[PDB]
Design a protein around this nucleic acid. Structure first.
Length: 82
DNA sequence: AAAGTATTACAT
DNA sequence: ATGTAATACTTT
């Protein structure tokens, strides 16, 4: 069992907010990420979109509005030792 | 239509 | 994967 998405500083930071919530919808994601980190609504989206494109996260259009669901669970950033 | 929340593309 | 941008759908 290894890490699928390549984690970084900005990569992990957003995951934390998604994991804080059960899953997350763009308003909760942006609303949180914008207050915590610099990143504007534009800036925020790459960490979501590219991750999804490469398999880190997965989006789903749920009944009301959409939910971004963590496509990773076992890994959830494998911080290797020096 | 406005405001808010969702969705994907382009450039780096 | 990261930063930045554009556009659509949903609810009000």
């Amino acid at each position: 069992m290894k890490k699928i998405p390549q984690i970084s500083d900005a990569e992990l930071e957003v995951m934390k907010v998604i994991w804080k919530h059960s899953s997350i919808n763009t308003n909760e994601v942006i609303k949180e990420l914008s207050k915590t980190s610099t990143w504007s609504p534009k800036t925020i989206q790459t960490m979501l979109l590219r991750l999804i494109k490469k398999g880190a996260l997965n989006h789903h259009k749920e009944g009301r509005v959409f939910v971004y669901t963590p496509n990773i669970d076992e890994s959830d950033y494998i911080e290797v030792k020096s």
